[PDB]
PDB file of C-alpha atoms in Angstrom:
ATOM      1  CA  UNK A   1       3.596 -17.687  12.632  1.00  0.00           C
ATOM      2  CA  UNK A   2       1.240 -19.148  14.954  1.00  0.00           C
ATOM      3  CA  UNK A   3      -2.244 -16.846  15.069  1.00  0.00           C
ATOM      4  CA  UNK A   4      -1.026 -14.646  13.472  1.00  0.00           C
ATOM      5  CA  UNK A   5      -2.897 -11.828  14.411  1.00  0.00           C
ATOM      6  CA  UNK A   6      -3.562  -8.285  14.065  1.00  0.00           C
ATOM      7  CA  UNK A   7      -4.800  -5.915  16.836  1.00  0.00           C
ATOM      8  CA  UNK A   8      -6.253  -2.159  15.812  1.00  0.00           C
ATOM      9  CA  UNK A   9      -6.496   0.378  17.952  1.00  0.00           C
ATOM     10  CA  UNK A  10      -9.473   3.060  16.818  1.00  0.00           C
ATOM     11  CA  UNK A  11     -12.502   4.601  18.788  1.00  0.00           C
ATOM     12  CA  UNK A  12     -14.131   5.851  15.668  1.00  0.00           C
ATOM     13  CA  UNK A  13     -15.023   1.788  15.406  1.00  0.00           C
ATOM     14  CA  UNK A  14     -14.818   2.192  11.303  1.00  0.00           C
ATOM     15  CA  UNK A  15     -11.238   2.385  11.100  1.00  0.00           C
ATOM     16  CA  UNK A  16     -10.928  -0.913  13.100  1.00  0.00           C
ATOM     17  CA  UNK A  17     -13.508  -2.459  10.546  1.00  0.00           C
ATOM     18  CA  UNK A  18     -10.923  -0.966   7.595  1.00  0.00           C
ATOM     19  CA  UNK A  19      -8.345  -3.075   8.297  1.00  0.00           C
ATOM     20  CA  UNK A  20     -10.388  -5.750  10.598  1.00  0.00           C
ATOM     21  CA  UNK A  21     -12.053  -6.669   7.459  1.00  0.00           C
ATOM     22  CA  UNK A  22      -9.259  -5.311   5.161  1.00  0.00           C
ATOM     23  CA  UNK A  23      -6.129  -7.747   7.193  1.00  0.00           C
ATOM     24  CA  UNK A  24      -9.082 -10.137   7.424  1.00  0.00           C
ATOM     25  CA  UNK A  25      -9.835  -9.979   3.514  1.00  0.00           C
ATOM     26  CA  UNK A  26      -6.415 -10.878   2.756  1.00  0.00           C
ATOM     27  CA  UNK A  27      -6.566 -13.898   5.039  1.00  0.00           C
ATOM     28  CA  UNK A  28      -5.321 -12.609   8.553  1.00  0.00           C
ATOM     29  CA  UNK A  29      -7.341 -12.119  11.562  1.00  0.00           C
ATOM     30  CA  UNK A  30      -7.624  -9.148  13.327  1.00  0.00           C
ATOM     31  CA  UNK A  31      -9.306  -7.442  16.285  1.00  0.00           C
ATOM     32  CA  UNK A  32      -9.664  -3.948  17.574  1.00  0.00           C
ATOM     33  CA  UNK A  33      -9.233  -1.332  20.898  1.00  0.00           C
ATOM     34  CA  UNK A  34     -10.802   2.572  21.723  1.00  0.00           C
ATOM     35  CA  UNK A  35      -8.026   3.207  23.331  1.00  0.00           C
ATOM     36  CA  UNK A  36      -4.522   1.475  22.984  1.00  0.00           C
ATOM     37  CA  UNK A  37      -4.961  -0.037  26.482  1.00  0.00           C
ATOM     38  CA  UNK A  38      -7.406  -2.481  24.905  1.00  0.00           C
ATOM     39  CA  UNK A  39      -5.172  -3.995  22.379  1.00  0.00           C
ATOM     40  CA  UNK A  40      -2.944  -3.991  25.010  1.00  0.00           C
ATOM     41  CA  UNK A  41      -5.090  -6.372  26.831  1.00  0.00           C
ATOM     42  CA  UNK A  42      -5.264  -8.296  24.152  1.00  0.00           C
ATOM     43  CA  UNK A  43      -1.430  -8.183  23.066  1.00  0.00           C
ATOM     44  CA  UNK A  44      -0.820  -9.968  27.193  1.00  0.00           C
ATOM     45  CA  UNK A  45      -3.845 -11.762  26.651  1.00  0.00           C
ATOM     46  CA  UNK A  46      -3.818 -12.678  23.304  1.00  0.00           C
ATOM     47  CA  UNK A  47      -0.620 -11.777  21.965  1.00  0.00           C
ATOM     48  CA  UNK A  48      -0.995 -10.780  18.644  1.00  0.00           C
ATOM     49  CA  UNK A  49       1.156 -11.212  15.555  1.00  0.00           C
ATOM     50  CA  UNK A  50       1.019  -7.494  14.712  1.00  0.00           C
ATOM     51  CA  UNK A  51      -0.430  -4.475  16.363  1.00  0.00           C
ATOM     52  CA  UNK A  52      -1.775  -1.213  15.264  1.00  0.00           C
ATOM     53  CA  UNK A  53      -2.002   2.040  17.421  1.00  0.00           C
ATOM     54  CA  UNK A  54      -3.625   5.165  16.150  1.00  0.00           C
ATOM     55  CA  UNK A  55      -2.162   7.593  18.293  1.00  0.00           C
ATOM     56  CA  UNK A  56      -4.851   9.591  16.068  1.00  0.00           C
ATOM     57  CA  UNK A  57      -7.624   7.704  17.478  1.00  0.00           C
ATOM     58  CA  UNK A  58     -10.151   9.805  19.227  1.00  0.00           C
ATOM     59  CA  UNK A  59      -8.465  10.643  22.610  1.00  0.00           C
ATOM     60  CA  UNK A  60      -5.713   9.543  24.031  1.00  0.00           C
ATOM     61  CA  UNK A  61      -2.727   6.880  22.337  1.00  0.00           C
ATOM     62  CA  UNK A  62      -1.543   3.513  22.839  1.00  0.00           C
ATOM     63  CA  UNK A  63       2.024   4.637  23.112  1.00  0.00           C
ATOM     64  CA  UNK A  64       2.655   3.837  26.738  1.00  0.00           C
ATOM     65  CA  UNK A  65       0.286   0.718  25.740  1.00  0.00           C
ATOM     66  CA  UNK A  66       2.908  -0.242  22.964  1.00  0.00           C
ATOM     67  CA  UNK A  67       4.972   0.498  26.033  1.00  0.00           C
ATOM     68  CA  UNK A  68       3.669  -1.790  28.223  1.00  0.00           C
ATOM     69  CA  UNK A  69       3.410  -4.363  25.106  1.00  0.00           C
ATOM     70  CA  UNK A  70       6.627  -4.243  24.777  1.00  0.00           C
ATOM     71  CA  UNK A  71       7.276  -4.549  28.393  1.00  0.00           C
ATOM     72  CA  UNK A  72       5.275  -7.548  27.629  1.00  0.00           C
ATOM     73  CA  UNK A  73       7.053  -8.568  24.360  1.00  0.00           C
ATOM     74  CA  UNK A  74       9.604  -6.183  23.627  1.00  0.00           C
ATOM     75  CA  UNK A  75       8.311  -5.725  19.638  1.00  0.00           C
ATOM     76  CA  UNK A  76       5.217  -6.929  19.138  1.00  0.00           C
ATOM     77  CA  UNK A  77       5.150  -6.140  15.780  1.00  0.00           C
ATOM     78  CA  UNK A  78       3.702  -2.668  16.393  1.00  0.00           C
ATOM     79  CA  UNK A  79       2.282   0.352  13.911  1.00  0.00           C
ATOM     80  CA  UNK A  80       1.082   3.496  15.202  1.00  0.00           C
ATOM     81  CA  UNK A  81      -0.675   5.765  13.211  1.00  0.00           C
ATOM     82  CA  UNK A  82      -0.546   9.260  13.137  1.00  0.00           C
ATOM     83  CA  UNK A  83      -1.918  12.316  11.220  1.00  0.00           C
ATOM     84  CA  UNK A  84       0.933  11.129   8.418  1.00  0.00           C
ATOM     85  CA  UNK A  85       3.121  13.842   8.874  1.00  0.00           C
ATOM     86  CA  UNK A  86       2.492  14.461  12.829  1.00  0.00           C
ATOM     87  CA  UNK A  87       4.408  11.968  14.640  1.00  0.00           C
ATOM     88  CA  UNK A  88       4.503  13.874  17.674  1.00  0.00           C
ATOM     89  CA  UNK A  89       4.870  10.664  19.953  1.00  0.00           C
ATOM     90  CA  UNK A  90       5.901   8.551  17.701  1.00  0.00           C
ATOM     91  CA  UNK A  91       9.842   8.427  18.494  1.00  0.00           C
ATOM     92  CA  UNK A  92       8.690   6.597  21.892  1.00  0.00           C
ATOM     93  CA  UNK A  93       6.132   4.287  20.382  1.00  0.00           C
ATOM     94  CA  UNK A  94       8.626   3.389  17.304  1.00  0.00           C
ATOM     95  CA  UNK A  95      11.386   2.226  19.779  1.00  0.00           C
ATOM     96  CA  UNK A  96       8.336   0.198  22.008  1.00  0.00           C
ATOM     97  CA  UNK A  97       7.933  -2.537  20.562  1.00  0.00           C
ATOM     98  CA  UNK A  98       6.685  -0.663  17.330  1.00  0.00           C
ATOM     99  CA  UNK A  99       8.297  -2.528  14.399  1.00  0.00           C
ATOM    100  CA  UNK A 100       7.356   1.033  12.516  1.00  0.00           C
ATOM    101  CA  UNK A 101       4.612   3.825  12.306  1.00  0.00           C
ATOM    102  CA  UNK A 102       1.492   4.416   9.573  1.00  0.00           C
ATOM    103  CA  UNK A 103      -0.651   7.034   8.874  1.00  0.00           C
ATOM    104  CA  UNK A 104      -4.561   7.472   9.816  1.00  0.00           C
ATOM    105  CA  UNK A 105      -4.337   9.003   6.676  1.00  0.00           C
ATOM    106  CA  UNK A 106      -3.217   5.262   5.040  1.00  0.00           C
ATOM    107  CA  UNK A 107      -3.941   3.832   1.817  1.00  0.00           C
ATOM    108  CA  UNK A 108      -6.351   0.453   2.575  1.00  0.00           C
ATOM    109  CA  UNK A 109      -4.171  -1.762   0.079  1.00  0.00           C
ATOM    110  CA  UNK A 110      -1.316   0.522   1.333  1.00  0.00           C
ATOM    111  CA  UNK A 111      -2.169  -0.937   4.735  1.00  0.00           C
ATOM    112  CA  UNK A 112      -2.622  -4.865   3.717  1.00  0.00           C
ATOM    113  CA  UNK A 113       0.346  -4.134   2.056  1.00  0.00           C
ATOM    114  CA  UNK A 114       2.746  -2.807   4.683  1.00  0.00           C
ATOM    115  CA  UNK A 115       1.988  -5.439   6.689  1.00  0.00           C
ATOM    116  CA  UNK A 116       2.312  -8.158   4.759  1.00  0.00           C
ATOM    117  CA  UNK A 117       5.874  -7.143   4.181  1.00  0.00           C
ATOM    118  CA  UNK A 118       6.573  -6.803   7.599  1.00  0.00           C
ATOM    119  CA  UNK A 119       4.513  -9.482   9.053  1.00  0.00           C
ATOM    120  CA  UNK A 120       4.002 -12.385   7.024  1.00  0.00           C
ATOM    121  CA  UNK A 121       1.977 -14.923   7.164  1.00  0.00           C
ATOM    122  CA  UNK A 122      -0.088 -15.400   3.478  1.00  0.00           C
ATOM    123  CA  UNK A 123       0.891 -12.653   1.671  1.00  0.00           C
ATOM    124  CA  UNK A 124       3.623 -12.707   0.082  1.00  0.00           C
ATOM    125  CA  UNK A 125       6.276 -10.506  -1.535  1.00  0.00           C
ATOM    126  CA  UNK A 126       8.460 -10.376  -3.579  1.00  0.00           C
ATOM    127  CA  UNK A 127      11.847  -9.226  -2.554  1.00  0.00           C
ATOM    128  CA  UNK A 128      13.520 -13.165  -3.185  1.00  0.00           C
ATOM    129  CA  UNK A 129      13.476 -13.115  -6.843  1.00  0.00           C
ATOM    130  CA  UNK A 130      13.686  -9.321  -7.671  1.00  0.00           C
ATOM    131  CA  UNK A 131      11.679  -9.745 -10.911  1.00  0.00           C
ATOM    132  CA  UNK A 132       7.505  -9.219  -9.892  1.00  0.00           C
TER     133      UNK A 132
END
């Protein structure tokens, strides 16, 4: 809508770059936390127009950060990633604020993607005409 941004949570610092550059490539803006509790300054701070949380990052989650995010905005627009098929904290961090869950596993265009379908800003789809 209005800076429309997207916050990634990784420690290994590549992953951020992924879809930093990835979101970014499409057109978005993005920006990136080792921990959770850094895009979670940045959600009060910045306030985001999506956030990511790889509860796979390397130590630790941002689940009670999505937590406090949405404690600060109820739903911003969150993703947490997990191990694809391990989820194990990702009931609590769906219902905060989480608008849904990906994988660390992801697909990059996957990624771009999913977002754009959720939040929207450039890139489209198409889901109005039914047709592609």
């Amino acid at each position: 809508m209005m800076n429309e941004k997207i916050l990634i949570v990784d420690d290994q610092y590549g992953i951020r770059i992924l879809l930093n550059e990835v979101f970014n490539k499409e057109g978005y803006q993005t920006f990136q936390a080792a921990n959770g509790l850094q895009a979670l300054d940045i959600v009060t701070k910045e306030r985001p127009d999506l956030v990511l949380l790889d509860m796979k990052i390397p130590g630790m989650d941002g689940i009670e950060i999505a937590k406090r995010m949405k404690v600060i905005d109820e739903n911003i627009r969150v993703i947490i990633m997990t191990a694809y098929g391990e989820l194990d904290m990702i009931q609590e961090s769906k219902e905060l604020g989480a608008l849904t869950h990906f994988a660390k596993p992801f697909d990059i265009d996957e990624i771009r993607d999913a977002v754009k379908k959720y939040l929207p800003l450039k890139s489209n789809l198409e889901h109005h005409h039914h047709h592609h």
